[PDB]
């Protein structure tokens, strides 16, 4: 879902 560096 979310990229490794997301959030």
């Amino acid at each position: 879902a979310l990229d490794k560096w997301a959030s």
Partner: antibody
Amino acid sequence: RITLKESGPPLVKPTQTLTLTCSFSGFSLSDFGVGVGWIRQPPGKALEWLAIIYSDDDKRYSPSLNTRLTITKDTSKNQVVLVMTRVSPVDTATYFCAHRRGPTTLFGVPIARGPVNAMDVWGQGITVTISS
Amino acid sequence: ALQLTQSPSSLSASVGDRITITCRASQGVTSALAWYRQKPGSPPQLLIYDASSLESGVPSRFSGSGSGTEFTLTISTLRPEDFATYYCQQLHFYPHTFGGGTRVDVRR
């Protein structure tokens, strides 16, 4: 200076397995948060993302090709290998590997993640034709 | 999955023009978006990373703005080497999608 270069067979037959190697210099896959990804481009078509691997060894794959792809790294040889099984004619494309920066650090402390948002250096690309 | 739509798909222009290419995402991708220019026979080249940061060594006529679902690349003064195909790429969600590309060619 970062450079990457793809190598493997220019021709492959349907149902066969395709192994592509990305050899690079200028960075190490042991450097913090670095990534190396693979992108392909069928002739005349758009770029298509395939997979990426990071130095901490997390791996991610295109959901559409997940079952046929394996990506792996060989840190000491500065290479990243992508194995695609059961190829068919639609897999004919130019295949590129590319570098992805990890976050900027200050005294080994991550302070900027903006640089990870791009694949910043690309290899020339290797043309692969799938035909029996 | 997430959709990235570029507009226009094709665009004609002349040396010296100002052009702007836009890329819209189906869900917000924050600022995780990159622009590339790809000349025939060559690999894509990074122009703008993180939606608006100018990549090192890239000429200042290139500019990127926007965040969320709408982004734009503008080349302020088109040079001959800019006749090419441009792509945007989202890096917020896996898979890291590319837009369909926009071809910029010599107007006549």
